[PDB]
Amino acid sequence: ELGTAFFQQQQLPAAMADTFLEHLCLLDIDSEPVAARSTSIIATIGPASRSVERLKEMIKAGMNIARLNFSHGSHEYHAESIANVREAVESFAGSPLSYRPVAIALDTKGPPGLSEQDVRDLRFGVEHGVDIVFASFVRKASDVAAVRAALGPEGHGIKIISKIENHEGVKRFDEILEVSDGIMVARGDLGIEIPAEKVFLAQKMMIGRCNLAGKPVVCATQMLESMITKPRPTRAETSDVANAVLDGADCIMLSGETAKGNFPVEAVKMQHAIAREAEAAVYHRQLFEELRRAAPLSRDPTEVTAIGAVEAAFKCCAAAIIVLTTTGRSAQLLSRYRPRAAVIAVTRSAQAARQVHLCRGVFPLLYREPPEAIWADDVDRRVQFGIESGKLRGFLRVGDLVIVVTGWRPGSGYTNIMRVLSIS
Amino acid sequence: GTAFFQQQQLPAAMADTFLEHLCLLDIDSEPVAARSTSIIATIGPASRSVERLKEMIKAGMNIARLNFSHGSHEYHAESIANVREAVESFAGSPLSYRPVAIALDTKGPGSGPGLSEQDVRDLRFGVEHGVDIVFASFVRKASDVAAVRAALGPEGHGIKIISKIENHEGVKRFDEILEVSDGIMVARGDLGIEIPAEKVFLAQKMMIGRCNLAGKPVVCATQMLESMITKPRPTRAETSDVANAVLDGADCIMLSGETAKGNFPVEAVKMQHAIAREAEAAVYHRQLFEELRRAAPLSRDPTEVTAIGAVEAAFKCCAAAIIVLTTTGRSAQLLSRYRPRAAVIAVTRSAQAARQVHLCRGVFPLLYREPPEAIWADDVDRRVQFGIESGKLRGFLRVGDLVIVVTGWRPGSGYTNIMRVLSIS
Amino acid sequence: RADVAQLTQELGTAFFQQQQLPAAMADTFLEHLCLLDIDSEPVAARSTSIIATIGPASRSVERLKEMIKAGMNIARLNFSHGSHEYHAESIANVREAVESFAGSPLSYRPVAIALDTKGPGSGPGLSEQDVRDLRFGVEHGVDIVFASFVRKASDVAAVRAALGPEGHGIKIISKIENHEGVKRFDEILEVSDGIMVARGDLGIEIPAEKVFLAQKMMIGRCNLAGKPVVCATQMLESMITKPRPTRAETSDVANAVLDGADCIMLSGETAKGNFPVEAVKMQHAIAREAEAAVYHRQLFEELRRAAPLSRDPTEVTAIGAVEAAFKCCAAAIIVLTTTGRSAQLLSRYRPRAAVIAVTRSAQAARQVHLCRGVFPLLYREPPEAIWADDVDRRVQFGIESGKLRGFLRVGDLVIVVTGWRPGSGYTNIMRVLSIS
Amino acid sequence: QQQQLPAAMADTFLEHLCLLDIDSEPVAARSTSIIATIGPASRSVERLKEMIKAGMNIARLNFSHGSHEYHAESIANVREAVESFAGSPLSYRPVAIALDTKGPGSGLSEQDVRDLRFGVEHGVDIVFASFVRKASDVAAVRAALGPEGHGIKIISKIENHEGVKRFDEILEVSDGIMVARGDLGIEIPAEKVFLAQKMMIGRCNLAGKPVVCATQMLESMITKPRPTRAETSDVANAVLDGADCIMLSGETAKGNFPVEAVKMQHAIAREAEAAVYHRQLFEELRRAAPLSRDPTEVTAIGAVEAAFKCCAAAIIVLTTTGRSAQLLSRYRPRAAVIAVTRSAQAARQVHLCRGVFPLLYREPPEAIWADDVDRRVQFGIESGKLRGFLRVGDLVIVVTGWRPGSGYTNIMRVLSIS
């Protein structure tokens, strides 16, 4: 069996509670997290965190997405920072245990329409192969259309995360979310544009709506602010990070903490440590029930397979859900149901591998073996690659159950199969 | 379409509370799904004719009960032969062939403390004549079930033992009896004389709830349509009793004198069919599925894990059916325990398993007769296609419907581990 | 376990094993069913009223006394049979049997008199025979009219008009007997005092296999509206000739109570059968078992969630009183009422505690039998000089009568519901009292 | 609608979050009490008047600093500032005085025995007992308060691993708990403090005992006029977690913006209280609160249920010790619990319970006890109207007892205002 020790870890006594109040009462500081940290960390790369050596430490500490703030620096300065990130990421390619994709995100300076500087910076993003754009001061759907148009003929695959920073963005949230790939709760400007005491309402509302829509949401700004000068955060800062994860944020961010502060690596380590504790404290019993009840009926096989796979994973306490994905969409649809099981996404797309860091609980594995002549063999090889990577990384052991999600034919858009495999 | 969402009590199904679900039940919302609660009809003088048996099979009889409290072995052997002749008369059309189980209902212990000598002889007769199920009378403890099992011998290991709970001791030792039985029958005739009549509904509801929780079949029996022994139409209490047995969670409903000796055996079957179909649509699946999942323990059995994933997937897309390949019936039983609204179409080569799965609510057995294809994946596909073609012919499926297909990774029982979303073409 | 541990130590484990209390404490409806226990004996007084049809087999004063003792709360007179003279004599016999127990509130049981109309026959509305029978009802002081074949709101307006100025206090229970009555249910319920699910005609007018849907829907809507609903016809049919009912019949009675019926009815079983008293005893025995098996935890939660917010102090006090009663496992809720309305508003929340309704109105005492769990106590003392003393005396009468009848025991907690000024409509006070 | 009522009507917690609206203005009075530490930056009578107007309900004196003479002068200044508003009885706001002990350091220390004696002699209402790690620590504090300090509330500060592990035994003998996050965040891993906070708040809510969230809630406001985004989030989340009180330490004791820090906690708490998902919270609290034969417990749940049914503007309760108001507060009604008491100490102490608004009764007594009760209820109504809690046409729930003295609450009445 699994043993009594298994059921005492990862807040499992609080997970089995019949009410949210009982769940809180059962949270235990001695119940150690076991699962891999699922909330991605976005770290802003600037003066304090640009060197290849420092970037290697940031990657080891847990950085998944490197943010470049185009309100500062120049194209040349940010191109060097991007090259340093890619050099630091590729320095781990000689070890499957440490190699991890890192997304590159361009955060625009901001705005009548798109500013001339934003057009040029978005063009720089396309030319430098950025994965994500954090679009500043998105106030309406037409702002997203303008950013999308500026990403032009080569950059349509770039994810647009709309930053909600003012009253209009909050009021027109639904129309903005509908055309965006995701949202950033940009609390710095939001806290100056609307009363500071109302920011938590906008944050909780936007995270809730993104969770309902199945689109990534980032919580940003001043999460560990005091760590710009101090080696340890305040009690409010650790609480803020934990509560952003409990609210439902897919990603958490560091700005000045990593861009210009004295402890960039420590700030990343702190977000990693808190997120892991907070993820185990999520009350999945209610969350899954509510996500299922609110999500409409669907005839899309990927969506149908995803909910079946997440339900199967909860039934057996599956160590992982291994999914084959070319665009990341099948992994994103699993992530929207918030499984406790890690979603190991095996993909040949380096871009999709970097971009799926936007979805909570997705662990991308970039697959580079040449395609097998028999498609069923190529699928089996990728599933075994996910399993062997999971064993090497500590997600899986022999005797564990894993859920495996695939499609009936090659190419994106055909996911329709869920299998239950015993790890051998 | 909007027409789809007005049928099968779908407005009541979408209600946020059980009270609002009741308020939204509509007599004009027609049932669409195939009737999922199996009908057990007792064989007797009113229903022994081969031609009458053909009408009973067409009316909806799924299990033929042989009551060994009446008649000799020669009588029951002729009943079995007539049942098999009527059932096999439809085998020439494999896409519409309906398996029918044969169940032997024992006389019981009488004044004795356990298995009677007549029950030993009757059980051996059952094994020799290939009966599918034993309804063991007056089961009072786990050792009664062990004695029935021992009396079936080495050749009767595959026969299902449904323990009849008929007295206070059987109700009190219910958990130990259920643990060793394949299922239970709430034998209300004797139960209503052994305990106060006004307490039988408590024992019925409790046993049905516990069987639903255990994922084991439960039968509601006796006097369900009693007045139809002599009258062409049942009383208001009888139609209510049948509907409430289905709403309670009974996998099967039974007819005794109504089919064994009455003047309306076919009409009694038709009446149970009509009521069960209306009552199944009136089940509040939102609460039932939530409570079955919450109560069902965590499992590391891949068949069980695939079954809950498949049922969840079926609810997500309003799947017309879950097509499952099964050797023993177990993969279909594990789907049935989650009470999907989608029909569980069970494709099997085992004639016995096809008959026995009628014990599980919502399982529609299809007996596949073709010998195995040389390539196993082709053999699996042909059986899934047989499930689809049978489903289209019977009205379960249409082009454009979504179905969930449940199969395993290798031949042989015990390896179900795959769930697939398929569009019917 | 922790939510009941202190009360389990105080009241004892025997208390918590009775009246399906282990099933009552279950967290899900499925667990509640699994915990139903045939050895868990009912303790509470039977709350679902029994309507018995009085006819040839049950007309004698001697037999009527046995029927009252067996549990009959409402006597039904079926104007499809007999005559005005025949029914007047049955009514006089019922009143003689009822008044034979009038020497004390411990023995007195008010029994309502209900007139069930012949109906419109082939006509579009109120027939001439119904006009005459309704006038007979008013002249003979009937408490309730079971109006046959109500198909729309104008049918109940016609019955109301035929009762005249003297019959304004008579309750109109609309019988839903056909497809149109089911389809126009909401408009009919709005203008009626309650509904009868008249399954005999309903089962011939619509497919027999659909009657249970109409029954469950109408009971649910009446429970939501807080108006009485009667389940009727063939509940114990075989008892017309047999001393024991079938398994389907006992199931039907239990399920009508579990569905939420305020009343259950006997027709031929008491009007013409060989076992009228035994049929009443059987409905009494089944209804007490089924009432204990109600899953109050979900029922109360759903009645709260569905019932709209209210600014009516009687309604606000009623929900507070029912909540208080559940918190302490109160033996009873004693309520002072002039029209029965304050007791009806307590009854709509389905407390497990008996609602002891103290009233000076003999008619309201008979009519409140339509509401589940209301036990009417007719108070006959003239008003005290000080109104607050008169209120206190009526509460003490409820307490003393309750103790002498086993509803209350010394040490029990009782919830008392009263108002701030005389007259109907001013209930606004809830008090928790310890019985000494 | 106002006070997040569209989010309040949601059928799931997820839909409730989706319906939260920054334009839905709070209307209800701020329920979560603010504890402000009184020190060098907030000692003056003039500053204390501004702190009281800003929303300070409890003045904390940190006995780790200053001296008996320094703290006695702070206490006198607090009382002078509080009493400067007593000329208006319908609007008078009581303010509790809480003594926070220095702690055991390396049983009960000799400095704590002297400071606790000082507390009793100066009539403090509450003791925040530092580093409580077991039930015997609470017994020692109680013994040190002596026979004259029987009425002082002991709020045990949970500051280390042992206090968290022995939480149940500590809560059982304490009047309430303080999640003292400063030391807790150094004694256990910083990333685990939120788990201890949420667990302790949940258990206190279940026990119906006050819980205080403390330390670094608005830390940056010691030097900056506006807090960080994490600080406003922390305050809001402490309220959403279920904290009865929120605290300011350095922000008011030594910072440059003590009044602004109080105003910020007030503004956030009011917004967060309206964002509480009462539908789930009430259902869970009501389900978990044990069955009881105590008439005050029975009346309290009946009154809270009645208040929710009619959207009551307030529950007016007469209380001698504060207990009847505390039992109403444990069910977290949206309706303000207006507690009318003659006890000045109970009026100050009842600030520990969320949503209890104490009114100190100083009107002449009525000869007949029933008449006296009616005028205390009319006092609650008149004070409620003046303060904006009540308007003509509102419904209120009134909770009283059957005889004088504490422990006899057993009546709930539905009253229409004016």
Ligand SMILES: O=C1c2ccccc2C(=O)c2c1cc(S(=O)(=O)N1CCNCC1)c(O)c2O
């Ligand atoms: O990237 C730079 C940078 C690059 C080149 C030269 C100087 C700077 C610089 O000075 C810098 C940068 C970024 C940020 S931030 O932390 O991203 N930012 C603070 C909150 N608002 C939005 C997010 C800075 O705080 C910052 O000062």
Ligand SMILES: O=C1c2ccccc2C(=O)c2c1cc(S(=O)(=O)N1CCNCC1)c(O)c2O
């Ligand atoms: O009241 C009488 C009666 C009075 C005078 C003389 C003979 C009879 C008589 O014979 C009688 C009566 C009543 C019922 S019933 O059961 O209430 N009822 C049958 C049809 N309508 C619906 C319900 C009878 O079944 C019945 O036969």
Ligand SMILES: O=P(O)(O)OC[C@H]1O[C@](O)(COP(=O)(O)O)[C@@H](O)[C@@H]1O
């Ligand atoms: O998530 P996406 O982008 O739709 O990709 C899922 C696809 O991956 C697969 O599992 C494997 O496809 P490939 O062999 O083309 O990589 C498909 O069967 C499925 O349609």
Ligand SMILES: O=P(O)(O)OC[C@H]1O[C@](O)(COP(=O)(O)O)[C@@H](O)[C@@H]1O
């Ligand atoms: O329900 P059971 O008895 O476990 O049978 C399920 C089995 O049926 C199959 O789908 C098909 O097996 P066969 O080809 O042997 O019939 C297996 O893969 C699976 O293990």
Ligand SMILES: O=P(O)(O)OC[C@H]1O[C@](O)(COP(=O)(O)O)[C@@H](O)[C@@H]1O
């Ligand atoms: O239930 P009803 O008909 O509203 O009667 C309740 C009324 O009874 C009382 O308790 C007593 O009134 P009376 O003294 O007129 O009988 C009133 O205070 C209250 O308004």
Ligand SMILES: O=P(O)(O)OC[C@H]1O[C@](O)(COP(=O)(O)O)[C@@H](O)[C@@H]1O
């Ligand atoms: O909340 P507490 O301390 O129990 O006080 C409630 C008490 O207050 C009262 O309402 C009024 O009592 P007093 O007149 O003594 O102030 C009592 O009837 C009740 O017992």
Ligand SMILES: O=C([O-])C(=O)[O-]
């Ligand atoms: O731009 C941002 O990230 C902000 O304003 O918080």
Ligand SMILES: O=C([O-])C(=O)[O-]
């Ligand atoms: O044996 C039976 O079927 C019975 O007694 O009901």
Ligand SMILES: O=C([O-])C(=O)[O-]
């Ligand atoms: O009239 C009735 O009572 C019926 O039809 O059931």
Ligand SMILES: O=C([O-])C(=O)[O-]
């Ligand atoms: O003592 C305290 O308040 C702390 O450490 O947080």
Ligand SMILES: [K+]
């Ligand atoms: K920017």
Ligand SMILES: [K+]
């Ligand atoms: K038999």
Ligand SMILES: [K+]
């Ligand atoms: K009639």
Ligand SMILES: [K+]
């Ligand atoms: K201190």
Ligand SMILES: [Mg+2]
């Ligand atoms: Mg900004």
Ligand SMILES: [Mg+2]
């Ligand atoms: Mg029997």
